[PDB]
Write a protein that binds this ligand. Structure first.
Ligand SMILES: O=P(O)(O)OC[C@H]1O[C@@H](O)[C@H](O)[C@@H](O)[C@H]1O
Ligand SMILES: O=P(O)(O)OC[C@H]1O[C@@H](O)[C@H](O)[C@@H](O)[C@H]1O
Lengths: 474, 474
């Protein structure tokens, strides 16, 4: 007795501006931190960058026609802040706004609901140069000016908005792991920037209530639900520590305005806790979102880890399977291979039931509606003769996730929509172009732009049918 | 470096009226449901009952002097509703109150803080005869009237109160498993009674805020933290179901005034959900407790359970190790042996790290102070020539738990106190006299009443030292 999907369930697909747009220095666009970082030697796969990406800035009309052919109910994209404020906080670049205005009109003219991500990792380099971007409280007012600019321009036409895409990733990768800009590896700096980002999220949610009173807004969290390895009490405890440090650290702030205490105490015991100003807690507690945005791709299995144990692990950026290694926080937990699930060529776990679990944990802890803002399978694809791509592996992945979503809905989770990552193939920040997620193949690779032609994959036709039957036929 | 136990930490021990008092028909006392139930053949181990028990009603001066010798900071006990209102709701029986007043006096005179439990499973049989007791909303006003009598009479000498002792257990055993009065096996009646107990709890918490404004009050929940057996997604999901169904079903209502949605929907799907009435929600939501009382003995490991798999299992009431079998809810989860822990002769898991896990979950989800209202080890004891009871097994159990408590406190959990189960040996409801938990041995068994003389066990002195050092020495 499964519930159906709701009559107006937002069947979607997603992109991010740096990964798709190209036109990195056209029509007055300023440099973003990713324009600079990606052109540093050694930072990205084979030196790939988003100078051209898949040229969505020029080809958006074609891409939207293909969305309309698919029957997409919603398209999630991000706004490139450096297109709108070339120097982050100066005068507005109207040509930048005009691009998003053309895109939104194009979507609406085809009956597609826009879902706008304010921030998908691309703070203008000028703010980084001026004051260190996310490490300065100055960014709170600067992010707010940019958000309000969009809210006033587009608020009439866009109802669904995402504030920060994966704060947990951009902050940890940028300031702990050194793998995203600004390339820092300093845990204290990381938790300071994170706190500032929390304040920026809250502040724009408050502004949103004034400028878009009939809208819906939330953050999109990169959620990997944690599992203990087995029922050994020390492994279950490792699991409580992981869930709290990796997940509650962010989601409790978004939902409740408070950091979890056992994590806080652990950080305070090392002088790593953020610097909290008077007024911070009041702001964080007075910015309730309409939904938790959830980016889900995999679960993580953890076990105990002694004080001299595993810290940073190797991440697979090449698509050679079995190249990842364990990571952790010495004393608290380490990741371990889950022997009950398959993995992708990039060593990501395939765990559709984990999505059902993550959705239940969120509903159960926070009582919040959930918009799944990303989910998808990143894999090698082959273009075959006759412009055919048979990505059965992708269909299988998506079908099983969408079935668990329906089970979560039947369990009583309020899921607003589902945005598959990604609509067209695009640039993977650290994995290049060969790690493909699209319904629509783009003809290019790491060595050549080729002709950038769009080619519908088998999954395109699978999803068109899912959407036509409102999820009744998977 | 661990945090120290705080300076005014309540180092306690506990009992319950039916299990300790005897004097079942003296001084005006009415029949309770347990007076009747225990006399029915087959309901108790070797037909044991509490007509005499360990005769605490006559020997309380001796017992309180033994508590003073130990150094106890607090003693948790229950009031026998049937001593105070022999009819449940008639005229108050002053001789009944007088005993509790004498007991409270003796406690205060020796410096010991009393913790009073309002309800420990012994509703007057008159109420059950009159209107089915917990199955009728009339018990809400009757219970409240009894609590208000006690608040008024003792509010100025008793600061800490527990409302219902293990609602989850007396409701479940009495209305689903048929092991406690009223001896019913009917899920529908179970949830209706449970819902009424919920409202009764909230009602008296509200009364308390008028009558004892400077006091602290909470329910005491029987908490077995759940573990998944392993990282199979289906087992983790079975763990989410078990924690929600066994634990959040109660704690969410105590803390937030709401039932969890997935358990609700699943019950609704079967017609098993409780009859809600206008005002119920407003009442449940307007009755925050000061703390969560936790009674803890063991964790439970679960795994996936087919729609046609395990339901009721064998429970060990004889102390013959290895006679318990798995229990489950078909389709949701079933219990399974945790290979990483030892068990007692009654097949209870020994899992002190489980306690820190549980305290951590409660603090993380509800942010409430915790009073550990029971914890202890039930085993066979041997009396030795010389009045020696070498209960090392018990010392080791309690040492480990107390150590995980200090770890939780350090992790940041606010534990107000710890009350070991039990001060003297006493009657176990279903297991008889041979299942002993006391620091003070009581000379009787399931065959012979002998003389009921109190002998200090090795653990008595152990705990004496613990209290002497405020935890510093174990
Ligand atoms: O590109 P990857 O590393 O395979 O990850 C896939 C996706 O990850 C999400 O975490 C990001 O929001 C996306 O921009 C995209 O990168
Ligand atoms: O007596 P047992 O079955 O060994 O249980 C030990 C304890 O269970 C607790 O939860 C009950 O509140 C106590 O009254 C005592 O019965």
């Amino acid at each position: 007795h499964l519930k159906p999907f709701p009559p107006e369930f937002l069947w979607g697909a997603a992109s991010a501006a740096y990964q798709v747009e190209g036109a990195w220095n056209e029509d007055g666009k300023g440099l973003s931190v990713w324009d600079v970082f990606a052109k540093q030697p050694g930072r990205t796969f084979k030196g790939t960058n988003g100078d051209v990406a898949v040229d969505h800035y020029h080809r958006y009309q074609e891409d939207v026609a293909l969305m309309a052919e698919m029957g997409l109910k919603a398209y999630r994209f991000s706004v490139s802040w450096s297109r709108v404020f070339p120097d982050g906080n100066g005068a507005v670049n109207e040509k930048g706004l005009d691009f998003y205005d053309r895109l939104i009109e194009e979507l609406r003219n085809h009956g597609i609901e826009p879902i706008v991500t304010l921030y998908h990792w691309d703070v203008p380099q000028a703010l980084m140069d001026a004051y260190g971007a996310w490490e300065s409280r100055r960014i709170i007012d600067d992010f707010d000016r940019y958000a309000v600019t969009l809210f006033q321009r587009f608020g009439d036409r866009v109802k669904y908005w995402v504030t920060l895409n994966e704060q947990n990733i951009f902050i940890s990768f940028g300031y702990r792991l050194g793998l995203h800009p600004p390339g820092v590896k300093d845990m204290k700096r990381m938790y300071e920037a994170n706190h500032i980002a929390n304040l920026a999220n809250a502040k724009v949610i408050q502004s949103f209530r004034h400028y878009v009173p009939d809208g819906k807004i939330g953050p999109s969290f990169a959620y990997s639900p944690m599992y203990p390895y087995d029922s050994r009490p020390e492994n279950v405890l490792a699991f409580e520590n992981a869930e709290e440090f990796q997940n509650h650290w962010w989601m409790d702030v978004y939902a409740w305005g408070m950091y979890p205490q056992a994590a806080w105490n652990y950080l305070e015991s090392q002088g790593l806790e953020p610097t909290v100003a008077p007024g911070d807690w009041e702001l964080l507690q007075a910015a309730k979102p309409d939904f938790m945005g959830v980016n889900y791709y995999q679960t993580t299995t953890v076990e105990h880890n002694p004080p001299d144990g595993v810290g940073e692990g190797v991440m697979n950026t090449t698509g050679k399977k079995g190249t990842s290694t364990s990571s952790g926080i010495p004393g608290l937990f380490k990741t371990v291979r889950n022997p009950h699930v398959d993995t992708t060529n990039w060593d990501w776990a395939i765990d559709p039931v984990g999505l059902r679990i993550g959705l239940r944990r969120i509903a159960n802890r926070y009582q919040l509606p959930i918009l799944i803002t990303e989910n998808g399978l990143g894999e090698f694809d082959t273009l075959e003769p006759g412009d055919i791509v048979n990505d059965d592996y992708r269909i299988d992945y998506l079908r099983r996730h969408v079935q668990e979503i329906q089970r979560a809905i039947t369990d009583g989770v309020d899921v607003l929509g589902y945005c598959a990552w990604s609509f067209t193939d695009l640039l993977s920040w650290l994995n290049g172009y060969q790690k493909r997620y699209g319904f629509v193949y783009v003809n290019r690779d790491d060595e050549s732009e080729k002709d950038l032609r769009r080619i519908k994959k088998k999954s395109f036709y699978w999803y068109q049918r899912v959407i036509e039957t409102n999820g009744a036929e998977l």
